[PDB]
Each structure stands twice: as C-alpha cells, then as structure tokens.
Amino acid sequence: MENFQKVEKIGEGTYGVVYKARNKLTGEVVALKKIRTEGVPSTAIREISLLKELNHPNIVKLLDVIHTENKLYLVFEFLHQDLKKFMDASALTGIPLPLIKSYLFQLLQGLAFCHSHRVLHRDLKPQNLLINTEGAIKLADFGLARAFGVPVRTYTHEVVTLWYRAPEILLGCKYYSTAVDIWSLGCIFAEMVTRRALFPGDSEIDQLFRIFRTLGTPDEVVWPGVTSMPDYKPSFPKWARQDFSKVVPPLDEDGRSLLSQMLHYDPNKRISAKAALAHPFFQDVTKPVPHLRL
Ligand SMILES: CCC(C)(C)[C@@H]1CCc2n[nH]c(C(=O)NCc3ccc(S(N)(=O)=O)cc3)c2C1
C-alpha cells in the first residue's frame, strides 16, 4: 500500500494487523486491516466486499476491500476510541445512565439495520464498538464467519474472548441467527451498568457454566430443543436461576426488563433489535456528549 502512508500500527485484530494510515491523495485518515495461506477465499472475499454497501450512521464504514498478492486489506472509517477503553476510563465513576442508554439505543439501531439486510455481526464486543466526540457509537468488524470463518485465535497466538458468546453458539448450533447479536449486546449493556463483565469465562465450558450459574441451567421448558443441541450433555450440572435483581444492581426495572429479554435462552424468545428500540427503557433516551480523552 503506497497510496497509503502508515501513521502507526494500532494493534493486531481478529484476522490481522491494524494500522492507522493516511491516504496520500485524499488526505483522509483511515484504519487499515491487513489479513494474512493457499486457497484464495473467493467466497469469503466476496462476502466482505458486499459489506461496502452496508452504510448506516451506527456502522463503521467499510471504505474499500483490496485483494492483492497473498493479502487482503480492509480500509475502514477511522474512530479514535473504543468502548472497552471508555469503560476502563470510566470505571471509577461509571458511565452516566443517559450515555449508557444512548449507546445501547444507537447500537440497537445499527443492529436493526444490518439484521434487516440479512447481515449478522457474530462477534460483538466492547473492543469493536467505536466511539467519537459527537456522542456516536458504531459497530465494526462484522465477522460473517458464515462464509469466511472464525478461529479460536485472531491469526497469530491471541486468545479469543468468549465473554459475549450466545449460549446456542457454545452449545454447538450450526446455524446462527440474528439473536446471537442481541445476546452479545445484552452482555455489553450489563457490563456498562455494573462496570464488570457479566460472564467472564476463560474456556467454552467455563463460559457456558458461568451463564448457567446466573440464568439457571436451561431445560426443555424455557428452551425447547436445548437437550438435542450438538454439545449439550445430560451431565451438565443443574443450577437454579439467580434472582435477576442481583445481576445488574442498581439498574431500574425498565432496564432489567429489557436486559432479561435480550438474555432469553431460546433464540426465538430473545427480543429483536427492532422490538428492543420500542421498549419503555428508551422512553427518555437522549444523546449526551461524552468526555473523551484522546
Ligand atoms: C476493532 C478492530 C477493527 C475491526 C480493525 C476496527 C475497524 C474500524 C476501525 N476504525 N478505527 C479503528 C481504530 O483502530 N482506531 C484507532 C483506535 C481505536 C481505539 C483505541 S483505544 N483501545 O480505545 O485506546 C485507540 C486507537 C478501527 C479498528
């Protein structure tokens, strides 16, 4: 990439290295992800390429996709901070409820949009939620492993975070639905509120059991079909569901009601992004200006 002038290496994404770069003709600053090997993912590459038309205020724009000599470069709209960093910076005081609500509402608008266009994210986490000084928050890095793939390592020795993984994925479901994104966003909502990850598992089974210890071990009553899932084991311990007021104190009942709907075990009972937008929790939603230190 000579049309680009690397500013600095930002980090090492889930597929490759990420650089901050400047386009030497437009002068625009962007985030450039370099991915990687014989096979040339023709379908994977095409999948990604269609995301260029997925344009919405709460989705980080995918400016270009360039396949050239054993490498795939994704050029993205640049934002200066992510939610993981903002949450860490706000840990002592906590993010104000009006800002939590604004961010949740905006993320639901973005998901409602992608889901309406049959696009799933599949790996939502604070680190891929980008924020700016105007109070906006945007979804980035749509995995779409549906025709690309999602390994247990980014690309070179890097532990995959399972904290936001929906239970159906952990139980081996082969077909992900839009509900997996709602589950992840529910986990993120809880984390913004309590300032601690909801289910910080360090292995797939520890992740699954942390979910069961809090929400109760699922059964055919609350999740028809759960006992026939690929990785379901009759030997799973049977934990009682914890009182929900214990999980995200001191969130009010409007917030708790919405969270409970985003965390239903049955993907078919889990609330959609479009329906969540209409939840009473958003009756007084506004768009505060966060104080960001860049
Ligand atoms: C999520 C990774 C992906 C999918 C490649 C993102 C694709 C879209 C994107 N846009 N800007 C960035 C970006 O990286 N900015 C610089 C920056 C962001 C956060 C922080 S931080 N940890 O808040 O201090 C510091 C600098 C990315 C990365």
Domains located in the chain, CATH noted: 1-80 (3.30.200.20), 81-291 (1.10.510.10)
- Residue 145 CB less than 6 A away from ligand 1: no
31 lines ligand 1 (CB under 6 A): yes
Residue 117: other Cβ atoms inside 10 A: 12
If you take atom 27 of ligand 1, which residue's CA is the nearest one?
A: 31
Q: Quote the DSSP letter at residue 232.
A: -
262's tokens: 């985003």
CA dihedral (242, 178, 39, 54) in degrees, to 10, reads: -130
The residue nearest atom 16 of ligand 1, judged by CA position, is: 80
For the chain, where are the E strands, in sequence order? 4-12, 16-23, 29-35, 62-68, 71-77, 81-82, 129-131, 137-139
Element (H, E) at 133: none
Residue that is written with structure tokens 């680190």 in the block:
127
Q: Give residue for tokens 């600095």.
A: 8
Phi, psi of 73, deg, nearest 5: -110, 130
Helix, strand, coil shares, percent, the chain, to 5: 35, 15, 50
Residue 94's nearest CA partner among 193, 171, 25, 174 is 193
Tokens at 140, concatenated: 């980035």
* Residue of 209, 215, 202, 196 lying closest to 265 (CA atoms): 215
Any ligand 1 atom below 6 A from CB of 33: yes
Give the full edge-to-edge strand order of the sheet including 29-35.
4-12, 16-23, 29-35, 71-77, 62-68
- Residue 154 CB-density burial (10 A; 0-12 exposed, 13-18 middle, 19+ buried): middle
Which pair of tokens denotes residue 94? 């906590």
State the Cα–Cα distance between residues 115 and 121, nearest whole angstrom: 9
| Both structure tokens of 189 | 């909502």
Distances (CA, A) of 270 to 106, 220, 264: 19, 16, 5
- Cβ pair 36, 154 in contact under 8 A: no
**Is 272 in a helix, a strand, or coil?**
coil
Q: Which of 121, 131, 136 is nearest to 84 (CA)?
A: 131
- For residue 251, give Cα distances in angstroms to 15, 62, 97, 245, 256: 36, 35, 9, 8, 6
Dihedral of the CA atoms 232, 237, 241, 246 (nearest 10)? -120
CA distance 98 to 43: 42
Q: Could you tell me the distance, in angstroms and rounded to a whole number, from the CA of residue 37 to the centre of ligand 1? A: 25
Residue ranges for the binding site?
10-18, 33, 77-79, 82, 125-128, 141
CA distance 44 to 240: 42
Residues in the chain: 294
Give yes or no for a contact between 81 and 290, defined as CB atoms under 8 angstroms apart.
no
User: Is 123 labeled as catalytic in the residue annotation?
Assistant: yes
Which method resolved this structure? Answer: X-ray
Q: Is any ligand 1 atom within 6 A of the Cβ of residue 162? A: no
Asked if residue 1 lies in contact with residue 22, where contact means CB atoms within 8 angstroms, the answer is no
Yes or no: say if 250 and 97 are a contact pair by the CB < 8 Å rule.
no
Q: What angle do CA 158, 176, 233 make, to 5 degrees?
A: 80
User: Taking a C-beta distance cutoff of 8 angstroms, is the pair 33, 16 a contact?
Assistant: yes
Alpha-carbon span 228 to 246, nearest angstrom: 31
Residue 10 CA to residue 203 CA, distance in Å, equals 27
- Whole-number Å distance between alpha carbons of 271 and 263: 8
CA 247/CA 137 separation, integer angstroms: 25
Quoted resolution (Å): 1.8
3-class SS of residue 21: strand
Residue 160: phi and psi, rounded to 5, are: -70, 125
**Dihedral sign for Cα atoms in the order 280, 213, 179, 220:** negative
Pure H helices in the chain: 42-50, 83-89, 97-116, 167-170, 179-194, 204-215, 253-262, 273-277
- Nearest-atom number in ligand 1 for the CA of 77 is 10
